[PDB]
Each structure stands twice: as C-alpha cells, then as structure tokens.
Design a protein around this ligand. Structure first.
Ligand SMILES: [Cl-]
Ligand SMILES: [Cu+2]
Ligand SMILES: [Cu+2]
Ligand SMILES: [Cu+2]
Ligand SMILES: [Cu+2]
Ligand SMILES: [Cu+2]
Ligand SMILES: [Cu+2]
Ligand SMILES: [Cu+2]
Ligand SMILES: [Cu+2]
Ligand SMILES: [Cu+2]
Ligand SMILES: [Cu+2]
Ligand SMILES: [Cu+2]
Ligand SMILES: [Cu+2]
Lengths: 317, 316, 316
C-alpha cells in the first residue's frame, strides 16, 4: 500500500529528569519522534517541514533505499540539507523488514547525540516468526544519553570533550520513566535501540530474554540472555515470557548510567510490574501517574500509520 | 537439597594495586565475595548480617526468583534495604542454571562500581553439556574498575565525573594478579564476569576460546574467539584446550585498561603458565608467591557450599 | 611455503586529519603497517630492526605460536624487548586461518593506542567458505583513535586521563579517508579491526552486511547486521552484495566518533560509491584524489608476502 505522512521538525523543551529540562529538535515536537508502522512492501512517502532555525535531514536507518538512494538523507552525499523553513519529501519502498529507525543525519554528534532527533520505524514482515505470533505486548525502548552543560544551547554538545551525565529510555530518566505492566501469561516483545552515543547493558530481573533479531532481521540461532548490550545504531528484538509474577526491575547495568547529574538512582530504569502482585506502601512507584504508551505499546496495536504520543511531547517557546 | 549459608557485610580495606589500597564493603570481608556453588533445583537460604555503617541488599543476578520475588534484593521495589547492624534472609530455588553472580543493589554505581560488593554464584546443571564433561579446571575471572580519588571515603564514586584509573581481575591489578597454571592436556573452563562498570576485551594469547555459554546458558551455536568482549552484568563461559605449552599472556585488550594510575603495565593481566616450561631469568613472574585459588579453581572442586578465600580478605 | 621478509620500526610523522600531524612508530615507516598475506600452513620468518629510540616487540595476534611461544612478542613473558637499534627474528607457522593482525606489545596503551604500531596479517584458508570464493573485492578497515594533546610527544598518552578526540579508519579521519569504489554485482569482503583503544559501531547505508567470521574464524551461524560493534582486539569479517547502486555512506555510528577535534564531520567515514552513478556538484568527494589501495584491496590481489603502501608512509 502507499502510505504518506507529514512530519515537522520543531524546537521544543523536554523534561528528561527532575530538574533537567533539555532543548531538543523533536520530530512533530516530541522525543522519541512519532512511531511509523508499515507493512513489508509498502510504498512510504514522508513530507518533512523544518520549523527550526537550523538545517536537518532524515536518514532511514535500515532502509535499503533500493533504487532510491537520493532519499537516504545524508547531507553532501545524497542531498543538500533541509534548510530552516524548508520542506523535503522522502520516498522509499519498505522492502527491508523489522525494527528500523530514523534520525537526522546533519551534525549528528549533537542532533542525534543530545537533541533527540530520532524515532522508531517498524516494518512488519509478511512472514513473521512463529514466536512473533504469540506476542501479546510489543515494547519499544530507545536508549540515549544527555550532556547537562549544553541543555539550553543549540549548536553545542556531542563531543569527546563534553560530559554525558544523564541517561534515559525513551527520553526519560528514572523516576520519570514508566513501568512495563504485564500480566501472567503475557508474551512480551521488546525492541532495544541504541539511539544515542552510549552503550547500554540492558538487564531484566526475574526473566531471561530470548534474543531473536539483530538490527531487525531474525537470527537463525536465537539465544537466551539476561543482559543484552546495545551500542549506537544497533537494535535487538527479544522475547520475555511473563510467567513469573513479581515486581522486577529492568535496567541498564552500566554502573555510571544509573545516575542522574551525579546522583542515584536515575537513568534507564523501568519495572516489570505484574498486575496480580499486591502493592506495598514502600514501593517506589505506588500511585504512579501511569502512561500505558510510554513504550509505544498501545500505538503498536492501532494499525499501520504514523503515531504521535503526548507523553513524549515537549514545550514550545 | 536445602542449603543454608550465613554471610556478613564488613568494612575492610584491600590492596588492589601497588600504590592503591581501597576501602570496600566486602561480603564476608573479602573481594571477590565468597563463591556460592549449588546444584540446579536446590533451595537456597542466605542469612545476611550488615556489619557496616550503610544500608545494603543482595541481588542474585540471573536467579529468576520464581515464586520468591521478595528475595530479589532491590530496595524500594522488592524490599526495604538492610540497615546498618540489621540482618535479612534470602530464600530462593536455584532453578536457573549456570554462571550467575550476586551483588548489592543499593547505590549500585558506587557499591558495585568501586566498593567490591559482588561475588560468583555457580549453579551446576543436573545435566551438563558434553563439553563440560571434559573440563579439568574451572576458572572465575571477575573484572572491575577502580577510582583512586575516592579510595578512602565511602559515599563517593561511580559517576561519569569520576575517573576510573585502575583495572582488575578478581580485585587485583597486574602484577598483583596471579598466573593461571595449567598442564598440557588440561581442558579449561573460564567464566568471565562484567562485575564493575567497564567493558573488557579479554584476549588469550596462544589459544582460541570456544564460547559456550552466554549469561550462564548454553549456546546452541558456540563459536570460537581470541578476544571476548565482556560488558557490565554479562557473563561468558569459554573452553580453552591447553594443548600449546608455553607462557601465554591473557589480558584485557582495551588499551587504557592495561595501566594503573597512569603507568603501564597494570590491569587485568594474567599469564597461562604451563607446567614444565623453563623459567627465564627475565620472566616477570619468576619466583611468584603463588596462590592456586586466585581464580577459585580449588574452591570449585570442593562441592556445594559457600567458600571464603583468605587471599581475597581485606583488613579491618 | 617459507615466507621471509624484513621489517623495520621507524620514527615518522603522519597526517591523521587536516591540522593534525601525529608522531608514530611506523612499521616500515607507515601506518597501517605493511600488509602480510600468507597461506594456511606457511612458515613465516620476520626479521625486525628497531630504528627508533625506544624498545618494541611484535606480537602476532591470532597466531597460536604452536611450539613457538618464544616468538609471541611479549616483553618480560616470551622475550626481552628489542632495544633501540637492535634486531630480532620471529619465526612461526601460520596454522591459524583468517583475519589476524600484529602490533607492538611494549607500552601498548601508548604504542598501539596512539603510535600506530599495528598492521594486518591475512592467512588464506585452504578451504574458504563458498561465499568467500565469490568475493571480487577484499577490504581492510583498521579503526583507531588519537589524542591530539600528545601528537608531538612520544612517551605520553593512552591513559584514562588523556582525551581521545580524533578517530580514523586506516589512520585517516574523514575527509582524508578514501571512498570504497564498487561496481554493481561486486561481492565485497570487509574485514573490520579494533586496532586502537576505542569501540566502533560500523554501519553500512544502503546494504545489510552478512557477518561471516569472528576473529578470523568462520561462524557456524552467520547473521545479518546493518551495524557491527568492533572493540579492541576483535576482528569481524562481513560480506556485502553490491546490488544497490548509489552513494552510500559507511561509518562509525558512535556519535562522538564522527568528530575531529570537536568539529563535525570527521572520523571513520567512507562512502560506498558505485560506478556509473552521476555526480552532483555538491557531492563532498566529487573531486577526490583517489587511492584504490587505501583498504589494501589491490595489495590483497598480488600474491603472498609483505606489502608496503606509499599512501600510508610517514615523513621522517
Ligand atoms: Cl499477574
Ligand atoms: Cu538535525
Ligand atoms: Cu543510524
Ligand atoms: Cu543508516
Ligand atoms: Cu538490577
Ligand atoms: Cu551496598
Ligand atoms: Cu546484576
Ligand atoms: Cu539482576
Ligand atoms: Cu596481548
Ligand atoms: Cu612499541
Ligand atoms: Cu592484540
Ligand atoms: Cu594476542
Ligand atoms: Cu549514517
């Protein structure tokens, strides 16, 4: 099918952590950018308008651009940049399946490293693995890092000289992240993305993960892990069988990453919360103001298309 | 079987490197903490007494806690922490096999990053791989990093603003590590652990490694490597066929990791020393004061239980 | 067959990036060092002369040194170092196949980290994989990092306290790298090496890579990837089918690595350029002074032995 989307690039401010507000260039004014969910073989058209003060592009990471290299999104290689106020249209066939993503390809150390210019692109295979058919909950986790010294200043950041002192999943740092709520018998697909410049060792308490896909393509030899290393650019898809009720933390095991501005706890932490487990008064997330779509799991059920999410939206000036 | 162990947490000082003594929170007053070795299916009970000034927990990494999530050891999530002076009992069924480990889950960036709050938990499958059948020597290597500026003061450390300037295997930096002594024909199982916050590229000279397990679970498709990347949390099990007599160094290949306080050589370095090879006058470890249990290989032959090692104890 | 050659170690200066000249210890005065290409089973003899002011060795990474451990190149473990002005002969059998490499093993944090003391050692297997038989272009990519503060300062560098602020493939930072020129239907073997102290996430636009070898040995279960993480000491071999004409950049996806001295773009970046794709006036490499052997692809076609490359030579 032909699927056409209109995307903008906006200057907004997002709250990454308690006391850390961050200026970003959000696709449709949010970080992570909108979920794009299409079927293998769809023809995709994306009309992009740059409502910011600086040039950008969009690169479609994992998309082969078969006969369509001029839509690859690389400035000075496949196009000139999309200047401030201008528009540009990308066209590609989604013939590469799996967990893909998209991100700016201008000034990437800064724009992708700390300005949140990225989002997920899910291409459903016409022939999914048998296990994929058992899945009852699909979860996106996009990890990145932040340099507080340049939070308020576009044009700086993302160099070896800077210090990454805050860490996140889907642009929030614990406790501002959200739990992953399941019930016994759920079959959970988690898609990990190394969206930023850091390496993240994602560990699930209480469960092993069956690693089934690397960069969106199914492994001939899947393997179990309790800790999956995710590095910039990569994706891993795993399956968790939710057959062990409890409250089980799920987090980046890199020790300095579970900090926020030098304080702990913080960083890419969630909790696998099973519905049947009674809540203790001392539980850190008792009475959490809950977002069921923090990992795009509700959007991923809503059919093909492009989905914004207000829990990811930042504030305009 | 039901296996019941008593553990303490103690404030002790350990020698990590020449030039670097470090204040740690040692399980049973040692770093690495004691080896816990049990069989698939055993019911484990661990009574913990906190003889330190700060709160802690113990999380059993890789243990599913099937029906026992309140023993998972996560403060504010599965329990309130064990306060200074207090005690707490963990109970779980060891139904997950393989190379597991245990560590504090309070203030993890500091307590696991630089205060030595970790140790190995080995669960023997009732049914081991055929490959494991041939093994004649079992070896534990737990890698971690240290920040000299906070060595004497609990309550600081483990952040991106700190500088990790010393590196170790089993809490020693070369030359204070120990050789891995083997004889021709040995079949050596090595279990690597990313116990601290760094990444370690473990490279064996003279030999390829067969990578057989990831996070303690056997791979359907094992593969050979001469360099295995180990990151925080992870474990890799490999097999080395000791069929190539010589002196073969075995070390982290991350270049800045083979330093100590800015000086080379240092860091996670050992030597595979084969029996019978003549020792040259200039050999760095000629006349080494040798500890045959530096990699827990003696303890690992002693059956199920909790094993302290005096070579790992700190001072009060 | 017996393969004997002569290597020297020279103090020279290379250009890593616009504005960054770097003092290195180049094998045969070049960085990457010379390509050594032999067949499985060959007997290799390397006569080394140190024409620098400091001691070095050469370690043959991946080479088992079966019955020849005294040629392993490790100072204080397998030999005394090769002092300034002296010579040393290495002898070994190339019985381990695939993508191997060689590097100094003295002061490695500096000498390998920032002084360019490394090169590729390719051992052709008697029984290549079928896909290897289809290869039309063989490509070596050795990644490393540079600390501009010590560019002029032998004896300094490669510690946690230093700052790696330039990044390269084959000792050049974009735009001083070279394009990977292919034609439609080419079958491209690329060998990635973690030669320096950094981690590199190598991403190919427009194409998936089939990962076929880890540290030079063939995987029983190869797998596709669009991003391959390469860490110090490791090698990965991949295959790209060149079936999608265009201009497709190919680079380290670690965000800070595509900088040069804090400026962007720079670092380990190349472009897969297909023959016959029309060239826009804004294409960054439209006027490139092309070196067809920047990835040793020509040398790799010229027989068994040691190959220098004038494009990698430094200035005395
Ligand atoms: Cl439930
Ligand atoms: Cu941008
Ligand atoms: Cu990308
Ligand atoms: Cu890409
Ligand atoms: Cu944890
Ligand atoms: Cu603790
Ligand atoms: Cu853990
Ligand atoms: Cu855990
Ligand atoms: Cu070595
Ligand atoms: Cu040297
Ligand atoms: Cu090496
Ligand atoms: Cu080696
Ligand atoms: Cu790219």
């Amino acid at each position: 099918a032909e699927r056409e989307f209109d995307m903008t690039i906006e200057e907004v401010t997002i709250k990454v952590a308690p006391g850390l507000d961050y200026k970003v260039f959000g696709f449709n004014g949010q970080v992570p950018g909108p979920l794009i969910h299409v079927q293998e073989g769809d023809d995709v058209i994306v009309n992009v308008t740059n409502n910011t003060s600086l040039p950008h592009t969009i690169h479609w990471h994992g998309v082969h651009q078969k006969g369509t290299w001029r839509s690859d999104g690389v400035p000075g290689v496949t196009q000139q940049p999309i200047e401030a106020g201008d528009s540009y249209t990308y066209k590609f066939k989604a013939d590469r399946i799996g967990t893909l993503w998209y991100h700016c390809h201008v000034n990437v150390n800064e724009h992708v490293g700390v300005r949140g210019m990225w989002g997920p692109l899910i291409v459903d295979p016409k022939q999914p693995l048998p296990i994929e058919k058992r899945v009852t909950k699909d979860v996106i986790m996009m990890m990145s890092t932040w340099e507080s010294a340049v939070a308020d200043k576009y044009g700086e950041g993302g160099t070896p000289m800077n210090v990454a002192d805050y860490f996140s999943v889907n642009a929030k740092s614990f406790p501002l992240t959200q739990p992953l709520r399941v019930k016994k018998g759920d079959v959970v697909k988690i898609r990990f993305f190394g969206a930023g410049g850091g390496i993240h060792a994602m560990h699930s308490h209480g469960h092993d993960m069956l690693v089934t896909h690397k960069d969106g393509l199914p492994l001939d030899s899947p393997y179990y892990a309790d800790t999956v290393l995710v590095s910039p650019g990569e994706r891993y898809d795993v399956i968790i069988e939710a057959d062990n009720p409890g409250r089980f933390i799920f987090h980046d095991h890199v020790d300095t990453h579970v900090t926020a501005g030098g304080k702990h706890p913080g960083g890419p932490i969630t909790v696998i919360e099973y519905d049947g487990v009674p809540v203790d008064d001392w539980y850190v997330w008792k009475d959490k103001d809950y977002d069921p779509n923090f990992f795009y799991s509700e959007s991923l059920k809503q059919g093909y298309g492009m989905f914004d999410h207000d829990g990811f939206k930042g504030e305009f000036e």
